[PDB]
């Protein structure tokens, strides 16, 4: 019993996109179907619903007249045609199976893994990667913290490693945040004080969309 969404990606504002959802391991025509979306850092928002033979079609007021739900029962497929897209439409879009309970109600029991739709004007931009060495005034502690600032890239994701992945235990890689149309992230690595700068620490940043990989060695200021 599986649901798999496809068709997600980066759409320019005012643009259009069609999402698909392939159902397997069950009789697709035996169920109502729906689309639920989750904006980054928010809770789920029900978008639309279609009954088994499409007799009932419902829309959230936020998408009515812009979005169209449809199903192709012989093909086990659910569709969502989205138009005049806005930044507020940026979300993870989930396909969900709806069960009609004989007490007279619908409930969502199976969900797909989701497909991300990013509505933005930004173009593919490789990040600027900066090494962050400590302040010059050594406090003399058991450990030292180094950092890496990854600035102004689009779209997500970026892959940040330390010493090409051989340093992982004292790492904090922070979630990416928007710096007006472009993303920014940071990471810190914490090690035994006496091992740095003697045993060298390098930040490596891969941005697959721009096909780049840069290395930044942390150096004493």
């Amino acid at each position: 019993v599986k649901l798999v969404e496809s068709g997600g990606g980066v759409v320019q504002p005012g643009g259009s996109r069609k999402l698909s959802c392939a159902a397997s391991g069950f009789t697709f025509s035996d169920y109502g179907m729906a689309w639920v979306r989750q904006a980054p850092g928010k809770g789920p928002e029900w978008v639309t619903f279609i009954s088994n033979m499409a007799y009932s079609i419902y829309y959230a007021d936020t998408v009515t007249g812009r979005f169209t739900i449809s199903r192709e029962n012989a093909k086990n497929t659910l569709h969502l045609e989205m138009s005049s897209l806005r930044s507020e439409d940026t979300a993870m879009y989930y396909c969900t199976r709806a069960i009609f309970d004989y007490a007279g109600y619908w409930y969502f029991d199976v969900w797909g893994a989701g497909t991300t739709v990013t509505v933005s004007s930004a173009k593919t931009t490789a990040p600027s990667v900066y090494p962050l060495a400590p302040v010059c005034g050594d406090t003399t502690g058991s450990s030292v913290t180094l950092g890496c600032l990854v600035k102004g890239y689009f779209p997500e994701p970026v892959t940040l490693t330390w010493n090409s992945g051989s340093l992982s235990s004292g790492v904090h890689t922070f979630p990416a945040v928007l710096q007006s149309d472009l993303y920014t992230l940071s990471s810190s690595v914490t090690v035994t004080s006496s091992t740095w700068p003697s045993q060298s620490i390098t930040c490596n940043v891969a941005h697959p969309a721009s096909s780049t990989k840069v290395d930044k060695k942390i150096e004493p200021r």
């Binding site: 025509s29 035996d30 009954s51 088994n52 033979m53 007799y55 009932s56 009609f100 004989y102 007279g104």
Partner: peptide, 15 residues
């Protein structure tokens, strides 16, 4: 309309 909803939704489960 609630009876129409229930009745139609049952009719739709037909296979």
């Amino acid at each position: 309309n609630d009876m129409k909803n229930y009745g139609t939704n049952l009719f739709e489960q037909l296979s």
